[PDB]
Amino acid sequence: ARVDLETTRAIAKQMFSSGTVVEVSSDEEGFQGCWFAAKVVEPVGEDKFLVEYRDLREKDGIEPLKEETDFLHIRPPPPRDEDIDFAVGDKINAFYNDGWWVGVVIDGMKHGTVGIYFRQSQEKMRFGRQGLRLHKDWVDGTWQLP
């Protein structure tokens, strides 16, 4: 409980209409702390939205994945601020495997790459700068830093 259900539902109803570009998350195992790009096909009921993924595909690998998601797992695309230089300890998102995955900066930028660690995979690697962003949370219609 660090978001308010009433407000979140209202804001989601307001902003996520047909055609709206969004990010959606999943409760499925191994997908905690990941945001996928998508677009609202249409709202469903009062709490849900049919979305079509920008990058994720159906099993043939060709047709865009389509799924229902609820108002607690959908958000707008965050502002990108690319004036940013990452510092060690910064909570970030890194784009790979078709998604924005939560990670932590473990080494400052060198030669256009940043050292990154992912807690989910317990894996460490260097990422190209333009595949990284500062992590932000969508709360009650407002973008906030951690």
Residue numbers in the entry: 206 to 351
Could you share sentences copied from the article?
Here, we identify a previously uncharacterized H3K9me2-binding protein, which was named AGD-containing protein 1 (AGDP1). The AGDP1 protein possesses three pairs of tandem AGDs (AGD12, AGD34, and AGD56), all of which can specifically recognize the H3K9me2 mark. Our studies identify an H3K9me2-binding protein that regulates heterochromatic DNA methylation and reveal the molecular basis for the specific recognition of H3K9me2 mark, thus establishing an additional linkage between H3K9me2 and heterochromatic DNA methylation.
We obtained the free-form structure of AtAGDP1 AGD34. The overall structure of AtAGDP1 AGD34 resembles that of RsAGDP1 AGD12 with all the peptide-binding residues, especially the H3K4me0- and H3K9me2-binding residues, conserved and occupying the same positions. The structure-based sequence alignment of AtAGDP1 and RsAGDP1 tandem AGD cassettes indicates that most of the peptide-interacting residues, especially the H3K4- and H3K9me2-binding residues, are conserved. Intriguingly, all three tandem AGD cassettes (AGD12, AGD34, and AGD56) can specifically bind to the methylated H3K9 mark with preference on H3K9me2, suggesting that a single AGDP1 protein has multiple H3K9me2-binding sites. In contrast, the AtAGD34 and AtAGD56 binds to H3K9me2 about twofold higher than H3K9me1, although the peptide-binding regions are quite conserved. Our in vitro binding data suggest that a single AGDP1 protein possesses three H3K9me2-binding sites and sequence alignment results indicate that the AGD12, AGD34, and AGD56 can each capture an H3K9me2 mark using the same mechanism.
